[PDB]
């Protein structure tokens, strides 16, 4: 019985702690504030059920925001690719002594 007395009385005593955004001290951003914000703005009158259909893309991008799962599978695929080229390729000289220290 999800009594929601805190809502009817408006106490909000619990609600603040919820969600990545929702006002945080010194306005420190969440790491994934944006995808979350979009995804919640997508979510209202649609309510729960249809929401798992239509807002799926937003939640997806939010997922990758959280875990960085796919970008890791990619980046792993590249770094593992590079070993094959390690004898066939010498990569990049600057990493070692380029303008990156001049860069700032």
């Amino acid at each position: 019985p999800f009594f929601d007395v805190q809502k009817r009385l408006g106490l909000d005593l619990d609600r603040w702690m919820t969600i990545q955004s929702a006002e945080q001290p010194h306005k420190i951003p969440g790491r994934c504030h944006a995808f979350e914000k979009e995804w919640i703005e997508c979510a209202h009158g649609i309510g729960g059920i249809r929401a798992e259909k239509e807002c799926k893309i937003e939640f997806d991008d939010f997922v990758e925001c959280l875990l960085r799962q796919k970008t890791m599978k990619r980046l792993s695929a590249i770094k593992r690719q590079r070993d094959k080229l390690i004898k066939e390729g010498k990569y990049t000289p600057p990493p070692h002594h380029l303008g990156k220290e001049d860069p700032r």
């Binding site: 990545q20 420190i28 969440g30 790491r31 890791m72």
Partner: protein
Amino acid sequence: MPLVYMNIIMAFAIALAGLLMYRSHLMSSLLCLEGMMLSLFIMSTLIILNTHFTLANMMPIILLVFAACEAALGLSLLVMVSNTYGTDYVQNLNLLQ
């Protein structure tokens, strides 16, 4: 998910299997439970550190509190069971599993 998290989760799975293999005097179980508690703590805190989901920086410590709190209770019961025997799980009065 990065391998480290998988490792801590596995430490949880061991921290449970140890509780349930469950043997001899039960004080070991309060240990294993507290270990379980610690694994959940660490697994939480790494996350709240991850996404800079700052408010939740408060939770792990609060988690810790109650969890430690119940364990703090647990010893007391052991005392009582220790009080009449010199503890062992092997001795239980109740019937019908």
